[PDB]
Amino acid sequence: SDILLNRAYQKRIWKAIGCVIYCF
Amino acid sequence: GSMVTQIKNELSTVKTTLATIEGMMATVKIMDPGNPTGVPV
Amino acid sequence: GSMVTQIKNELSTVKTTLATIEGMMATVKIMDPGNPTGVPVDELRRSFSDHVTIVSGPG
Amino acid sequence: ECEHCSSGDDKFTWFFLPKGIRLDDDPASNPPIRVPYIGSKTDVASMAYIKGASVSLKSALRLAGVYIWAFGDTEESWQDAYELASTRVNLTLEQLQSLTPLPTSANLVHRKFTPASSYAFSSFVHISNDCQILTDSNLIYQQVMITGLALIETWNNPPINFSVYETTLHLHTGSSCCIRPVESCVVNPPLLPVPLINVPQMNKFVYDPEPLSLLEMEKIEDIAYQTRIGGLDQIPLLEKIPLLAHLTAKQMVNSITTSNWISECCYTYIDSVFVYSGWALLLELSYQMYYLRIQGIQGILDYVYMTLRRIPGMAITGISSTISHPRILRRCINLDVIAPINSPHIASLDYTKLSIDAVMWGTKQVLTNISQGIDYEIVVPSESSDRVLNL
Amino acid sequence: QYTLMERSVNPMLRGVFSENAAEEEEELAQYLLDREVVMPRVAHVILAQSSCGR
Amino acid sequence: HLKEVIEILKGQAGPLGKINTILRLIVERILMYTVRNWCIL
Amino acid sequence: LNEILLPEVHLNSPIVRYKLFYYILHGQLPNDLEPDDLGPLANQNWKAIRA
Amino acid sequence: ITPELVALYSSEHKALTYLTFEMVLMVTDMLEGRLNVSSLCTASHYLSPLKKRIEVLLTLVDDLALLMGDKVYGIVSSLESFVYAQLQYGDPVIDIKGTFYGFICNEILDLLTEDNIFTEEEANKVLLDLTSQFDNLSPDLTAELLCIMRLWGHPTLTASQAASKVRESMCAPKVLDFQTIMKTLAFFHAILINGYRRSHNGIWPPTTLHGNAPKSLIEMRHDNSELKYEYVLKNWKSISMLRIHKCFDASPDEDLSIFMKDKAISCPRQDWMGVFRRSLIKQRYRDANRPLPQPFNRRLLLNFLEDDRFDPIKELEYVTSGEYLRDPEFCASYSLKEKEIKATGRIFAKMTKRMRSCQVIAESLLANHAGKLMRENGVVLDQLKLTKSLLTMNQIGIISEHGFEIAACFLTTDLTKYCLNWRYQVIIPFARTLNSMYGIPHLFEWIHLRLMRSTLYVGDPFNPPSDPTQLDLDTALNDDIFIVSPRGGIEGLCQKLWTMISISTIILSATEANTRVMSMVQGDNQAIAITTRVVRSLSHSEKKEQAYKASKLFFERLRANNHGIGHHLKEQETILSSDFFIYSKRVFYKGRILTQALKNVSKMCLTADILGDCSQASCSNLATTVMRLTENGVEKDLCYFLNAFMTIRQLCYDLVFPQTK
Ligand SMILES: [Zn+2]
Ligand SMILES: [Zn+2]
């Protein structure tokens, strides 16, 4: 059930992680 | 008695195949242009 | 229970033939003679002029 | 650069033909194809819908609706329409008034294979009236779109089979003398008495002595009494807008579970539209989530998210079209319903995912408000039973 | 069509034909048209959905 | 949300495409759950 | 009244070969028609028909 | 020039010809069409490439006409299909490219060498000359070479020759498959039930399950659930033999417009010779010592109008009671059809007043209640959504780059000879179930039953029977102008039932091959868009090859089914293409409808056929044809100029050629 992530998806995920860290 | 059951279950298949044969023969008979047929009601 | 067993095997023989007849009946051919001879209709008129209300299949 | 856009005028129907089209060539190379705009025929919202209505009954209803829309809605304007319908039916005045469709914006439409064009280059053409007002106006704008398509098609005549450059047609209808305002539906009483109209009472093809059954008469009487007492739009103006939002949300939910709702959504509360969309979808999925033993608000939210994500993209195109409209898009952005994310340009936005996000926001709002205790009204259209007990 | 309609004696179309049908249609068109504002579209529709128009 | 997956899997043993899209949606939802709650991990 | 019910201006009826054969045999018009070409018209007593 | 004949002689060729009035009208219509087509090809830059090719085609087929005679219209009708054969000569699929082209070339060779007018070498040379005018043209122009069809006039018609074709399609032995009939009947029942579910608030019709129905069918009837076609194909022995009871409260007098349309009615059988010219039959009647038959001139409309006691229920009682099969007055006859060049369809039939009224009532009953229930095909009365559906059907396989994709292979079938090939034994079950649904004991199986008991004939006033001793229709033999006991149906008559059967057969064949299709059956031409799933990354040629390979099984199943219900499908009728299909004589080529403007310009004449013959009517007709020209790709500037020019031309013609002094 593992899924793959496109490069833009990776940028999305890492930016979201940054946003979560910044806000939490 | 079990023998009976199987026989009832298998006679169900006999029923359905006999009904299929009956309907098929009815359709055949009603397919003769020689004798015009009318649908009931 | 034995008589009912004799009829148990014999009925299985019936089941199979009924299946077989159905097979052939399902593959029959409905043929229309047509008027190849070209006989005057007067002569060819050997057919009912009257509808018959016979029930086919269910009814 | 367009000379009408550059000088004051701003109303137009935008046409676009992409570059790189080669007919009778590889479909992959040329831009995507689509069924062009070939016309829009008649497409009633009456007080009560009658099933199996006779031709005479339909004709009488048409006559009464047109009469009331055109000449007025006084009591004598209703008496004259009732008499003229009585030349073709046998209904009494009360059921006539009740069954007659809405006397608002009457279309007045009145009455082998010949295609209007080859649809060669018109199948690749983009059309958008986003810079236009929009039932004479509807016919006018359909005519404008057809004229633009035919102009694009005659720009590349059948001798021409290629498009090495992308072309744009503006077709500005604004700043035009011909377009005019519309004023009608005044009260004009008849300056002449009603003529002695001979009527073929016995002829079934002209007059129907019994156009309504006893059950139909009972149902129409019940509907009229319920409207007179329970009411329909007697509610104040402050209550109509949320009710319109609720009704259009129910329509959207029934659609998902060129058709659009921009006309309604531009004149209602878009945040309330999506809130009631979430409420209606929750009502639809309540039994399914109950049989799956879902617990907690987040369980409902996850279930509705996956349900929205699993519907085909063609089904949600109705909501997509409404949200994609620039005015509705800006409204949704300003009400925090919609955030344009993960797209360099607005036109590249995933409007299907955007609509799913809007419905999810509405569902979350409904769940939170229910948890805090803010009850939400349930509407039961086509009911004056057991379906209300089910709802 | 008038020559066949006035000749018709069929049970259907028993009352369709009227000798003063033209006069009745003129009176009805006057009723719809002899108003403060003339609306030929409305008159055409109402005539076409009236008994004379049928 | 794997109940539908197991139901179709048992029914067939078309459906595989539905199986894959449901699995992808579930895993993506789990991924956003993780990203949203990344700090407390 | 015949000035309203004018003959057809365009074709609306099938072309019949035996109509032309009838009109060219009625007047004994010159022709190279074989006996089978005429079909049933060859057996007619054109004398009475001409009379 | 005489009122009856025109004697034309040319000293240059030393040729003398005689033209009757009808032939004079044909020649002047055909020459006007030639002038219009040639002048439009000269004028329009779009049609400019076609001028030389049309000229050479006209010259070659004119010399061929001089050489053969009336058989050159066979060559013309072959060119009619050779247009499509050349159109499918450029499809990506190798296994479908050139099949129709080669077969039509073979058929033209057969038509040229049947009478031994041309030897094999000469016939091949003539075929090459005919074909060379079709090659190296754009698809649009190859379709606009379908204007030439009426550019060579129409054949001289004879009753015997026209009767021979229908006497052979009918009156011929035809073997049918019981199972194929029962499978298509089961799918017919399934489609009827599904349509009645899609209407009437999603509930099954009143139905009575047979004794062979399984438990699953009993539960689906009880739950009022949709019958999936895969289920029907499995249990077809119970989906059939399923009696649908009365569903519609249909009445014969539901529609009045049907009764007020004039249809040709035949004379009573006792006087059937009154159609023929009095001169030809006078002597043969004198030698038999019998009175001359009374001429018949009544019309259906006038007869219906002048009935003091006319009840449509009593009209339908003619068929329902069985009186039609006993009426000694009943008489049906054909008559030569105008403006047709093909051997088939050269006649149309006329019946008696009571049986024409019964036929129109039955057709109205079918078209209003049961015909509405099957919409597996896309044809509807609304032309706008019809052409929208046609465009959507044609654009199935056209996907751009803006995984898996979709691919389409289109099949077009001609159903012209279907009417003659329908047999009672293959339609009786459908007729019986329709009778049950409508409540009528016996209505819809009337055409074949009445035809097998009556002798038909072709009624032409100048075509009397060859034998003068055959003065009664019943004793007539199966030769000359007679068709004794035709077992088949007549064109147009009971077409709704035949169309519904064809739709059921198409759906059965699609389900048997596990292939999605979108039929567009229309009575004459049916179009099927076979759909399959292909890899997106695949090449276009390979995508179309995969689509054709998927469509191969469906086409085989459709051929087998049509042969089972008695319609043998030949190479002429079917047209398999990965690019286009044909609907209503218009081709849908790669998301386009090809122009065929020359066909419209060929019928732009100098007067309207209406009786008043005003200048306004003629100018309006010209304007309508110019509108068609604008819609069919001709330059709009040229169309405007042409409209003004021919309006001026028509007014000047009416001024200088006054109809009345
Ligand atoms: Zn502009
Ligand atoms: Zn103006």
Numbering used by the authors:
A (entry chain A): 2209 to 2232
B (entry chain B): 246 to 286
C (entry chain C): 246 to 304
D (entry chain A): 1186 to 1228, 1232 to 1299, 1308 to 1330, 1337 to 1459, 1478 to 1604, 1609 to 1615
E (entry chain A): 1024 to 1077
F (entry chain A): 2101 to 2113, 2127 to 2154
G (entry chain A): 4 to 54
H (entry chain A): 217 to 618, 658 to 916
Give the exact sentences the study uses for this entry:
L and P function as the RNA polymerase complex, responsible for replicating and transcribing the viral genome. To catalyze the RNA synthesis in both replication and transcription, L sequentially consists of five domains: the RNA-dependent RNA polymerase domain (RdRp), polyribonucleotidyl transferase domain (PRNTase), connector domain (CD), methyltransferase domain (MTase), and C-terminal domain (CTD). P harbors an oligomerization domain (POD) for self-oligomerization, and the oligomeric P attaches to RdRp of L, tethering the polymerase to NC to extract the RNA strand for both replication and transcription. Here, we resolved two L–P complex conformations from the mumps virus (MuV), a typical member of nsNSVs, via cryogenic-electron microscopy.
We then combined Lintegral–P particles from both unannealed and annealed particles and finally obtained a 3.02 Å cryo-EM structure. All five domains of L and regions of POD, PLinker2, and PCTD involved in L–P interfaces were clearly resolved. Different from the conserved RdRp-PRNTase, CD-MTase-CTD of MuV Lintegral–P adopts a spatial organization distinct from those of PIV-5, though their individual structures are pretty similar. The detailed alignment showed that MTase and CTD in MuV Lintegral–P appears as an integral on the PRNTase side instead of the RdRp side compared with PIV-5 L. The overall spatial organization of CD-MTase-CTD in MuV Lintegral–P is surprisingly similar to VSIV L. Actually, MuV Lintegral–P forms a continuous positively-charged tunnel from the GDN to the K-D-K-E motifs, ideal for the RNA synthesis followed by 5’ capping and methylation, which is favorable as the transcription state. Our Lintegral–P structure revealed four P molecules assembled into a helical bundle around RdRp of L via their respective POD. Different from the previous analysis on MuV P alone, four P molecules are more likely to adopt a parallel orientation in Lintegral–P. MuV Lintegral–P may bypass the MTase domain as one possible replication form. Models in (c, e) are the composite atomic models of MuV Lintegral–P and Lbody–P via rigid body docking of individual models into their respective composite cryo-EM maps, which are B-factor sharpened.
